[model samples]
Structure formats: structure tokens, C-alpha cells
Target: GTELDYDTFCFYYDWYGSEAIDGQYRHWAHAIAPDPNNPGTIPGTQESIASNFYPQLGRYSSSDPNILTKHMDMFVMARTGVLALTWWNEQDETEAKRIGLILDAADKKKIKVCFHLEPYPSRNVQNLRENIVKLITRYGNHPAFYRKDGKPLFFIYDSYLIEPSEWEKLLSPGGSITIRNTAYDALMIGLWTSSPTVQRPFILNAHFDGFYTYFAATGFTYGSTPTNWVSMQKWAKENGKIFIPSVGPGYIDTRIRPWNGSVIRTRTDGQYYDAMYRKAIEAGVSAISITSFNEWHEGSQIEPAVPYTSSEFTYLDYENREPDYYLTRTAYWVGKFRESK
Candidate 1:
């Protein structure tokens, strides 16, 4: 518990379509579920507003207390130590309330919560500094908020958008925008979706505490290559930095992004999941971050999905396997990781 010798954090995307609070037109709600009547239509419904990633839960409100509780319980059951809540910015009242509810639910289950700062356009160092300060000021005291070495930890998704020189101003030890020795200073890890050898210089120059590959599908990029984990871990340790490799069950979101079908990766039962974790453990890293717990749009969710069918398309299902197969498999891998340590 002290400093988390081996921590497992799952990316938690709270954004979901809702019909009750809004209208019947929900992202997941609009999805056409498997129906016997729709002979020519696919089992999944196409969304006019967004992607076609239909959730097994249908269109559900992120603010629903029942769903939030269920999420916490499932994470606990899966043995995931932390949830990295994705954030666009400090705005969005709906998101803020949902975050609060999640914090409450996570606290009840004793699961940790962290921030996955997204790359919203015009997110300069000044605004980011203010955002971090506001985040800590409001939720730092919450029991579910994640901390390491007595400071809150943050994950900056798509950190590449910000120039290394600009990041240096905020992250460098004593640069103009540096947070070091400031009230907002905290453990910060940046996204490294490129080859580690090529990206290492940028991260070091930017003064990041560490870096991680957020893609669930292995080999999507040089950074996500499993074979490179050992070298990356060695480099991070030698540099006195942390290496938190990310692992995911699989990936598929062609329904949402028509041009991105090349990124599809099969689950191959649980072998793919196990292999990723195996590499992470063998690489001897301090932590591992799961690509996602519930990011249905990318089809990287580890959440339970009920079997369904539609005339036009046949959505994948656990079929003979239990609904909680991924959750149960995740727990087993967590145990394996700890045992290796």
C-alpha cells in the first residue's frame, strides 16, 4: 500500500449517451440491438449523432447512481487498483457531477481514482496549471483520489499535442511554467505512443516523471510493442524514472470510425490479455495501466456485455463464457503480477 510497489490503473471514460436525462436520442440508446424483426438491418443500431459503438447496456446515463455503483463493484472484483477518469477540462457541469458521484462510489469500494487529462485544443500551460490546482483543491481530500509519494498522480493523454518546449516550461524543474515546489506540483506521466528510443529525449527534456502507451491493441505503434517493454523498463529505471506500461484486452471500433478498421485486434479468448500482462511483469515495471475499463467507442471495455443479435450485423458476445470473463481474467493477472514481484 505504501507507494504502490505494483499498481494497476484502468482508464475510465465517463462519457456515455443518455436518454432519460436528455431525450430518447442517446448514443448507446440509438444503437439497434439484436432483434428478430429487423431481417435486413444489423443487430446494432447506427447513431446519427456519433459512432456506431453500441454498448451492451444500451444508452445509459453516466450520472446514473446504480451504474456508477456497479462500475465500482466490478473494478473491485477485477482487482484493479485505480481508475484514471478522463477529463476534457474543468468545464461541463454534467461531467463534474458524474465525477463526484464516481469518487463517492469508488471510495465506498476503496478503489483509487486519478485524472486522465485529455488534449483539448488551446490547453496552454496556464490553463492546465489552473485546472490541476482546481482539481486538487476540490477533490484532493477525497478518499478515492489516487496519490503516490504523498502527491496526486496524473496521466496526460495525447500529451504530444503540447510542444516539448512548452511542456518544459511547466514540467521542467525550474522552468517558467514549472509546477515543481508549487502547490499544484504532482506526479505527472505523459503519453508516449511513439518509439521509446525516439521519444525518450522529448520526455526527458519535458521533465516528465514517466511515460505510457495508451493503445490497447499491441503493436499499434512502436511504443505499444510488447517486445520493447524490457528495454523501456531498463531505460526508465536507469534514468531514475517510472515506467507504467499499459495493457488492454483487445480493440475494434470500425462502427464508430469507418476509416480506422485497420486497428482491429482480436481478443483471442484471454490469451492476448494474459500475454500483455506477462510482458509487463517480466519487464519488471513499477505499475501497469489498462487501456480502459469502459471505453465502448473503441471497443476496449472490460465491462460486462450481454449477448445480442441484429439482422444486419452480429455483435460479438461472451457466448458460453460468463459475462464477467474479462473481469475474472483481470483479477487473475493482477494476482500474477503481484506474485512475480
Candidate 2:
């Protein structure tokens, strides 16, 4: 058996768009999703954009077939079994189209596709039923759609944004609009921030299948703090739930959250990545979650970043290491994890 068959999940963002590809720049233009009202005025050239680290592919559209192909290639090299694609809003025409392309590519590459459902506008548990139905109905039949024990897996990002009682409506087996046993039934994993004092009850009462620590910055939140994960995972297992602690190459989002630099975690030339993975493996959870394959805005990406000097900013590279360094490094961790207790 290969490490690729393990539950090594990585977060993937696909909201990027370029005029040459999508006829209008999407996420590549602004830090805040780039709307007309707050359309960013900086980053004159695509390369001059917001990300602290520059993408090896430059400012490219997310839906480009060529880009998707290369990403799948990298996924295998990195030993990722699943790619949790950021599903912003399935109703959006562009987002709807993107999933089809991604699943098709993932299928070819033998990489499973899971959803990391981000908080979309007007997102309430009431309409969330419809949103999920739309996703399952459209793509659930695809071979790449991820499932565990016959249930699709969903990572609900920022789940604490909603009241726990509100989630109970859909997640609880006997609740008003429960997805349980229905066609939309899934292994629903909620984001666990803060401490277990509050989060433990929230996950249980909400009827979530699991909790995943999503942040890459250690100690930024109680969940991201490694010292806390071992106990947290034990408690979660006691309650019959999955606890996935996240790992990342590093964290430096000063480009977007310019005022919020105190939490920055230096790459330390990949030591940060190794240490976090070590902690997660030591925590001995059934799975490991990577903060991102590419989240450049927050500088949490493992995507190949190169030393580039534009007139505006000298982008951060992998400390003179090859662009593929992280991919190989991730494979190393996954291999060790496979052999770990």
C-alpha cells in the first residue's frame, strides 16, 4: 500500500481568475475577493499583486485546464490522497463550472475530491440544505467525489460563525431538515477554533462527524496549538468523532492583513513544516489535514513559490530551495506518518 491511499487531505483554493483566462480578474486582483466597490487599486501588474509569495505559474486563472492538470500532477508527487477544493458557492455560475473541470481532472489523476465549504453570502442552515443538494446532485456521481464508509465528506469552514443550535437542524439525525440517511448524507466536519471548553460541546450538539483545525499559524487559536491537540483528539475519539489537526509550510499574510503580522510563523527553511507534521503525527489522529496547497493571499500555500523581484516587492521564495521542495517534503512527512504510531 502507498501513502497516497492514506487520509492525507490538503486544502485547495480555486477562485483565482485572470482577464486573459476568465475575461475579468477574480481572486488574483484583490485580497478581499475583489468586488467592484473595493476593487484593489494596487498590484498594477498581476505579478505585482497582493500575495507575499509569488506563484510559480504567475497570475493564472483557476479554471484553466492546463493549470488543473499540473496541480493534479503535483498532488501525486506530494502524496495527497484528497484535495479539499474550496467550494465558495455552488450556485455561482463560475463556481458551478469550476467543480466539473476539477473533478474531471482529479478523476484522471486518482485524487479524491472533497469540499471545504467556505462561508458564502447569506449562508444559513435553512438554505444550506439546498446548497448541498446542488453539489451532490451535480457531482456526487463523479468517481472523484470523496466518500468514507459510503458518506461524502465535507469540511465546513468557519462553522462557529453560526449558532450550534442552527446546525442541529440539518446535522442531527432527527432534526427538521437533517441530511442523515438522505442522498446528501455526509461526514460533516466542522472547524474547531478556540478551546475544547466551548468547541467540544459545540461539535457534539451540532451532530458533526468531526472537527478539523484549519489554521496554519500555531497558537493563533487553541485548536492550532499543538500542545492541545493530543488531549483534544483523545476527547474527540471518546465521543466517536474525527479530529484532524492541520499542518502548513508556514504562515505570513502581511501582504493582505498588513496590520496583523504578529502571528506570522516563519518557514525557517521547512523546519516549521516538519515540526507541525511531527506534532500531528505524534497526536496520532487517523488523518492529517494540510492548511493549503495554494492559499497565497495568507501565504499559507505549499504551492511552488520562487524568488522574484518586481519594482514593488521582492517575493518570498523557499529560502533558495527548489520550487518543488515542499512537495517532496510533504511526501517525506506522509511517508513517516504512514510508519508512525
Candidate 3:
């Protein structure tokens, strides 16, 4: 297995907004119910947004310095070393600057921050060069700006949306717009959203540094299913590619993607999380990525969540365990992972 700078990386969303904190509900209003249950609602209300678990901090803002510090502290508690913050686009420099505060907070706690570049509107290979350049030049020197092998790391979510030829133009050494060994060089990780038959060639051709399974719902996709990870790891080893298997506690997004309820995964207490972590370790992969630290919409958060009964919805609790159960449980698994090394 390839040696990873950090054994664990967790997805961290900068989307949460609070009326009291940000003057307007940003992403928390994403709690809109299915059609006929129209419109949206703010956090900490009787009518909630998409998440099944109510955060211990309630409707907190990601921009809050105190909240940012608290989140970093909790990640430290769970032994999470890197936080993959979501980056939408370079259009919003205010948001970009807002993210810097998180980097600052992470530095204080000795944690690292990396970028999870999402598929923003009008995104493509043609414009990615300038985007990557600005991102690095803007924050490359920050202590918490995570790096490995003398280069910054980027997780390109849903990267398959771009054709292999297009990716090659930017990733391959001699391709049209290659960024390799350039001022904008980065360790780009693509999302493994398909079968090995389709994924292998795409990765090799596209010249992705490696790949990661980002879904918390194991069976939702072939590459994300735990049973398939062993072969995936084997393929990576044979191809000299880095493979990171992501683990999550569970998934449930009935409030938002109502029709997708059939795929809901029950936590079954901490057992689901335990099984997922065990699979990632047993697969003998070098590193692991967590689906989320606070994806409340999908109920995949390992962040502390408390029981709350509102007039409209009674949020699901962590099942007889304390709010921070997942954090402690994660430490136990991380300790076990260290022993495997």
C-alpha cells in the first residue's frame, strides 16, 4: 500500500448557514420536503430541513470561528487528520476568503484542509487551469493547506462527467493543457463511480493521480459497495494508483430526495459504522476517506447529533448512545487501523 500523509480524511461542508449567524439561512434551508410539501424551512424549527439528525450545535454557521474550532476539535477527537472542504467556484471570492478562516482554525489544531472541487455550473477542463492556479496562489502558503509529495491535493467529485480525452488534456504530461509539473500542479483524485471495467481505463487514460469511493451508501453504486473494495484495492496496487475507501455511519435523505427512500441505510446503532470501517481496513487500502463529518441532508454525519422532537418531525437520535458516540467509535477504529500498519 502507498504511504499516505494522513490515514483519514473527512468531508467537511462549508454550506451550513444560520439566520442568526449569517443573517440568512444558507444551506440549512435545503431542508425542503418533497413536492406538495413545498417551500423550505430554517434550522432549529418545528419544520426542519433534509437531515434526520439535529446537530448538537443546532443551526450553526460554518463561518463561525467558535464553531469552526469546535468542528476541528471534534475531528481531532475522532482522529480525522484532513478535512476536504467543498469548493463550488472561483466566482465567489468572498466565500473563498470565508473558507480561509477554516484553514486558519485548522492550523491552530494541527489539522490539514484540502479541496473537494464539486461540479459547479459551467465547469470543464478548459477553465480548470485558472481555477486551480487561483486556488493555490490564494492559499498555497497556508499552514493548514494540505499537501503531499510536494504538491497540493484535490478531490474532483463526479469527475466522470468530463470525458477521458478532456481530462487527459489537463492531466496527462504531454496533453493539450497538461498541468503536470506546472505551477498549478496538484494530486487530483477522481471519483470512482462506475465498475472496474469502465473505471480502470478511464483512470489510466485520464491520468488521475488516484481514486476514491465517496458514497456513504455502500450498495448504491458498484464501486462504492464494500464487497467490491477488495478487488478495487488489488487493481490499484497492480496499477500503482492510490485507492481510498470512504466509510460513513449510515445514509437517509427522505426529507430531500423523497423518492430515493428505498436505498436508506440504517445505522443499527454503531454497528453499521463499525462494519464499514472494518471493510475499509480489511481491504488493506493505504488511506480512508469519510463520506462526511456533517452531511445532515444525507444523515451521514459522524458529528455529534442530539435527540430532538419538533412539532413536525422528530429527529432520529444516535440510538441510546451519547451524541459523540460516533466520534469515540471512530477513534477506536482509527486505533485499530494504526495497529494494522
Candidate 4:
């Protein structure tokens, strides 16, 4: 019934790797630095400790121009519409520098890069408010920028976390882009998770595209198994809301803290993953988001790790990784899902 019959999905990977290793100055270039004034919690489980320091991530750094080029090349070749960046308002000189280098190179490659801002906390609107614009102008118009209905798209992880007015103020005058709220819109959004529905209020909101559901393959509190993502798909499609569905192979929150609710249970097989994708196709979802290309900490990550395939470390082999079980099965599903050209 529509020209864009393809199942709309997005492939996103958290770009921040981590700057410091065990408190010493270990400059990996892509890693974010911990805040000097407010060091993060010592015990919050994270593949990278950047989350421990809470909202204060390091500033961008020009740690390695070549590294920037390499990451951009991967995303561009992969045809990724957005690179999901984690954390903001930190003091890492290298992170900011690396971002500059990446943006500069991305301009040459003509790719759209979007920063996934953390939800506002403690109402400390000073540093975040100030630094956010610097970033918006710095990377907003990259040639590789992804536009929904001709406008750039910005995604927020937690919607209820911030005051609505303050949220609107940040993007004002820049011509609003679409925002994918991860909280209230979770249930309304077509997702492959089992988390409970965060409240959904049709308030007088800002101008943006739509919100995305929580991590895929997880469980929702309300529906448990009954929450048909297909029903949400139908509602969003019919309403003209810019809803985007999220999919993933499975979830692994065990490292952080065990979720009491039922997980995806059985890992998604290749055929089942493909079927889930086609369901998006049938629902007329144009935009899609993958759980991740790599979240090495979360077992949910799509990137293959070592020792799983063979004891001799064959898992590290790139060729052995294959195109994930899902990509192996379907045409619509591809490693290079969003190529610009």
C-alpha cells in the first residue's frame, strides 16, 4: 500500500568505548574520560565504566584522526543512518577532539551522525544546556545526516526524565528534528522486548518524529507475553506517527542486575529473526533499529565474541562472525542496511 514497503529499522551501536582503564590514563582514543570532580560509582556494572560516572562524560578529543576515519568508514560502508553515541557533558579533551575529526571526515563521506543524549538528571540545566548546542551545530548538518520527512532525527533515551519545556528550549530555532523517546512511547512503539509500558501521554509536545521502544528481545511488564508488538505496529502505522521498531537477537542484563521479569527466553534463531523482520515489513514500518552491532558487555550485542564457535578462538575470526543469524536468512536484513547512495 505504500511506496516504502520495506520494514523500517535502524542499526545503532554505542560509539563511546571508554578513555580510562582502571583509573590510569589509558587513551584508547574512542573511550570517554571519567569526570575528575565527580568520579562515577565504583560498583555499577558496565562493559565500559563511563556509565558509572553517571551523566558527566568526557568532552570530545582528537585522540586519533586515523581511528576516526576507521569508525566512520565502517558506519558508512555499513550504511548506518545513525551512530548511537552514549553520554554527554563530560571533561574528556580527547573525546571532543575525536568527535571533531570524525565529523570532519564524515563530511567528506557524506554521512548523517546523531548523538543519543542521556535523559536530563537533577535538573542541572547549566552544563548540558550550554554544551548541547555546541555539539548540535558542530555535527548537525553532516552530509551523512539522516532525515525523516526531510529533517534530521535526534533520539532521547528517557522521556519522563526531563521537563518538557526545557527539552523544547534546547532544539528551538534550529528547526526541530524528530526525537525518538525511549520511555512513554515504549509500548506504543513496536519492539521485540517484554518490559512494562512506561506511561504514554499525548501532551502538547515539541515537534519531532517519534519515540523508539526499549531494547528489543527484552520483556514488557504489562503484556509479558501477550503484548503483541504487532498491535502497536498497527496503531502507529495507522496514526501516521513516525514510529520505529527495534529488534535484536536477545538480551543479557545478567552482568548488571538480573531483571525479575521473563527474558526473551530462547535466543532468536535465524529464521525467527527474519520472520520478525518481515512482520515489520507487513506492518509498513519504514525505519528500524537494531539492538546493537556491538555491546560486548551485554550478551545481547550482535557482534560475535570469542570461544563460542570453537575452543581454539575461532570466534574472533571476522568471517566466522557471519552476518548475524538474522542477516544470514533475509534479504531485507543486511549488514549494510542504510547506505547513503
Candidate 5:
């Protein structure tokens, strides 16, 4: 319905997945309910939005009248849309309520709130499908559902997880909707996704408000390599598609990795993210998504925190501050891109 503007910016949040907050280990805003239906307990802790930096607020207290009054000013100050209220499962009533709380707060602040959904493959796929429809039916009518041609926009994180036929059928009339699987959510989130990949045989009509490649490999897995991004740029420009590039400070697999092995982690500084921004711009795409605002364990977040001090490596080493280093670099390149435009 809308073409994505290269100058836009967005950041996705694995909001409740971290085991630490601002370098301090906290159980955090999420808790895994042992899935009585499934084998393993869901990963991450459970609380809700407003835990990490916003202390003492607890979860779902938006029902409290003072809640909006307390944070409305801050949200307005942020000036950026807050992309919170997400979890692995597509349909979470609790998360839905949490999103509603966020929507209320955002409305008071005059900022936008784009609720996110992740649709991992599972046996309950059918239920996840219905849940997405229910969410759209409920929130699509809400004032926050971004619209271009009057259709409420929504996003799905992993578009690579589903079949192309399924994508087609899901959007069909009275079909089991595949909002859980398609990247159709981008138009909703104010970003564009890729047109089509060679590996995936089927192609989607450009009905999506915009496109986004949520393939996390380009950032979390590629380290400092620019190959993946180069490939994306070629595809996007070739198809007249607008794209959003995702960048990360770095990643740590502490929660999932076997601790006994020699922990191999890549420690990146602000320079790395700066390079990423440049690459995105060179590729002719400008909108960029940072891997996180604050993902402590993965070491990929840009959230401000206590400075990491070290006795050695003194040239602004170890003593790096959360946003100061990263955001400054982002500003440098963002300004550069703006100039080129």
C-alpha cells in the first residue's frame, strides 16, 4: 500500500529475552511458563514492558491511572516509536493486554506503538494462525494500526519459516491467515522487505505495505562481514524495492551455548555499527534497525548502562558507555546519508 522511505529508522526488540539488565543479572520482565502442552519450558523470563530501565513500574500496571501520567512525558521525549510487546508465540492474551497498555501510553505521548509478533514453526501452528487474525481484528481497528490504503499494518518477524503456498493460501479469502509467517508485517512497521529470494520458488504480490528481511543472519551471525548485506542490496535495488538494514553491536550466546567450551565471542565497538550504517547507505537503502536497544547477554544492545571500565586498553576502551558511543556513530552516518539524499 505504501513504499518504504529509505530515510526511516526502526529497532526491533527481543524485549523480554535477556538474562541481565544494564550489565546486572536480573530475572527480568519475562518468565517461561513450562509449556504443559509442549516439552521444554519457553525460553526467557516473563514480566512485561517497563521492567529493564523503567524500574518499580512492574508489569501491566497501566490499569493504574497514574501509569500514563508518570511515563507520558518520557515517551514523548523519546520521539521514536516504541516497538515493545512481543514474544515467541503469535497469540498471547497477556502480551495483548500489555500491548494495549503500551498503546494507551503511546497515545497520551503522541508517539506510535508498533506491536510485533513472532511465528516460529510449531505443532500449534493452526492456533497461532487464528491468534494472529484475532489480534488484527482486535487491534487493527485500534488507532495505532498504521494504514496506507486504509488497511491496518502488522509485522511477522521470520518470513523464511513458512512455505510460499502457505503464504498465498493464508491471505486468501477465509483462508487460515499466515500473518504469523509472512513479512507482510513490514508495511505495518514502516519498513520494506525484499521482493523475492531465489531459493524460495513462489513470489508475493507487492500488497505488503513494505518489505523487510528479518533474516537475523546478516547481523547476529555474520559478525563484521559485509557480504550478506551486499547481497541484500543487489537484490533490493534490482527490484526497485526499498529495504531496511539491521545492525548489531555484537552477539553472545551465553544462554544457549555450552559454557564449558572456550567462549568465542566477538567484541565490537561503535565503529562496527558505523560501518554497518555506511554499508546500508551504499547499498542504496537508508532505514536501519539496530539489533537491540538493550540485550545484555548477547552484547548487541545500545541501551545506556554503567561504563565498562578496564585497567588496560585505555583509548576509550572498556570504559564504553551504552548509547553515547553507538548513538553518536549512528548520528554521524545518519547525517551523512541524509546529505546524500
Candidate 6:
């Protein structure tokens, strides 16, 4: 059974841009700079192109030691453990190397690392099993690898890609290829959708240890709504599962996906974050996961972003505050969360 100790974790995105790196170096870099293509106009803002990040770091690479070190320091200062890194595939050598560097840096800061398994093309139970095994074999022993009750933990992003029936083969105890009681056994968390009807069936059928919503903008989805967290947590207990509610400062992915503006959530100068944290505590959840620490492409990052402005669009900024305002605010809530425990 899971304990009641509230564990706060931040979803960390290591993908970014760097000048010296080759092969997709800025693959998902923030659109902080002016976009000539937009001709200085974006739908929601006056700036032609804008990123949630401030102009401080400019563009950084995940592989840079300084960047990684700084990130870990920030997380430590905020009292968040477990950097849930977005991972595409095991065969991707670049990602594997990046994970190594992150692990190395995180270990020194006493922060843990866990994988947020991405939904790669053609992903299924068979291949996923191999990937999990690979993950455990290669990095399980690392000091920074997150573990609880002697099992490494993993977050399955877009878990619906593999049908529940197929997931059973890997997650259920009696399934043909189940990892339960096996060497690769892990504490797997599946993503939940907005509907209670849908979430219950998926979680029960897939036999996941828990379920969570990765989206920060809550009202759009019942599962994502902070107000519904109490009921969600109740459902988890009744079903013998854990519930991890993902909260974020806000969200805005219009720069990458033009049609995504409807999903935007306002930060309200950190009030949104505070409300989410309070709800998570009210729900009596065992743990809480953040939407992201640096998912700049989607504008869900809690990492510092400076006040920026352009002719056609103006990006949001932490006004009257230093770059580390979010980090400092995070520390305050984390302290409050601990007091409840």
C-alpha cells in the first residue's frame, strides 16, 4: 500500500537548443525570438513570436553541464524530487546520452530521475516491455533513478496508444507477458483523460498502479480539474490505486500548435499554482506531479521567463520579480505541503 507522505515532483523536459550541438539541436526550442514567418503577429499576443521563458538563458542545450547543474540546483531549492524526463525511445542514442548527463548532475544534488515514456510510433506492449527492461538494466542501479518499495517508477505518457487489452499483457498479474513479479516489474502510472467513465475503465483494464493528468489547463478536462481532485483521489482509494494530480502555473502552446489557444490557462501571478497545490493537499493524495519544469514549447514551464515584448506580440513575464520567482514560490508551497503531512 502507498503511504500518505506527499511527494512533490516536477516534470522536467531536457529537450532544448544549443549552438555547438548537431542533429536536431533546438528541436523544441522556445519561440522566444521574433518570427519572420509570422511577420510580427500572433493570435493572442502582440509579439510576432513569444516564449514563456524570459530572455535570460537565451537558448540552451540539454547536454550542457552548466544548464543541467543549474536546473538541479533550482529543483533542490524548490524541494521537488524526481525529474520525470520525457523519453522517446531507447534506441535514440542522443536521448540516452542526455539522460546519462542528467542523471550524473542530479545525483550530486540529491534529486531523483524517472522516465516519462513518450508515445512513439508503433508502440505496443511487446516493444514497451523491452524498453522497460532496457531502462531497468541500464539505469536502474543509478543512484538518481527513482524507486519506491524496491521498484523503479515510470510515467506512461499517452498511454492510450497501447490499447488496454494490450497493456494488460505487460501490466496485469495474470497476463501472458506481464512484468509483474518479474525483474522488470515497475510502479507504472498511466495517463487519465477528462471523463470519469473513461478514466475508470482505462485504469482498471490496464491495471496501472495509478493514473494522472499531464495537462495544466484543468477546466477543459474533468480529470484535470483541481476541484475534482477529491473525487479522483477517492476513486483511486476505492480501486486500490494511487492518484497523482498534475498541476502547472499555466499553459499556452499557440506558438507550436496554432489551434491550441483555447486550452490556455492563466497563472494569475502564481494563484493558479497555489490553488492546485491546495487541492492536491485537500485530496489527500500520496504524491503530486507538476506539468513541467521546462516544457517551453507548450509554454507550461515553471522555469523562469523574463518579461519580453515585441511589435506584434508580448510574452507574459514575472513582473516586479526576479527570474527565479517561480522557483521561490514553489519552495513556499512545498513547505506548506509538508506541514500537512
Q: Over the stretch 1-341, how does candidate 1's per-residue lDDT look in tens digits?
A: 21222289999887764656644444443233333233122222343323333355666767788888888888877888798999988487877898899899988878889999998878877899989999999999888888888888999988888888899889888899788988788988988888666698888988899988899988898889999999999889988788899999888876555557678887887778888889999998888999878887777888887665555555676556667898888888888788777
Model 6 C-alpha lDDT per residue in residues 1-341, reported as the tens digit of each score: 11122277798877675665644445443333343344233332224333544445656678888888888888876778778888888477778789899999999978888889998888889988989998899999998898888888888988877788988988899999999999888989998876888878988999999988888887867778788888899899999997989988888776656656678887787888888878888888888888889887677777878877666456677676677877777788777777776
- TM-score (C-alpha, index-matched) for candidate 2: 0.94
Native-to-model Cα distance after best TM-score fit, residue 82 in candidate 6, in Å: 0.9
Pick by lDDT: 2 or 5, better one: 2
Model 5, 197-254: lDDT tens digits are 5321332332233345532234323323455666655665665544566665544433
Instruction: Tell me the lDDT of model 4 at 337.
Output: 36
User: How many pairs of residues collide in model 6?
Assistant: 9
Worst 10 residues of 1 by lDDT: 35-44
Model 2 clashes, total count: 0
| Model 3 agreement with the true structure over 1-341: per-residue lDDT tens digits | 12223768999998877776688667767655655535444454435655777888878888788888899889888888899999888466559656888999998878998899999998899878878888899899988888887889899999999999999999999989889978888989999987778999999999998999899997988877999989999999999889988899999987777767777899998999999999999999888999889999888999999888877788899968899999888888888887776
Model 4, poorest ten-residue lDDT window? 182-191
lDDT of 2 at 146: 92
Model 4 per-residue lDDT tens digits across residues 39-119? 222232222322111111232122445545654554444454455555454557755665666557666655555555565
Q: Provide the overall lDDT of each model, using Cα atoms, as 2-decimal numbers.
A: 0.79, 0.86, 0.85, 0.42, 0.44, 0.78
Deviation in angstroms for 149 in model 2?
0.9
Using lDDT, rank the candidates from best to worst.
2, 3, 1, 6, 5, 4
Stretches of candidate 1 exceeding 4 Å from the true structure: 1-6, 24-26, 29-56
lDDT agreement of model 2 with the native:
0.86
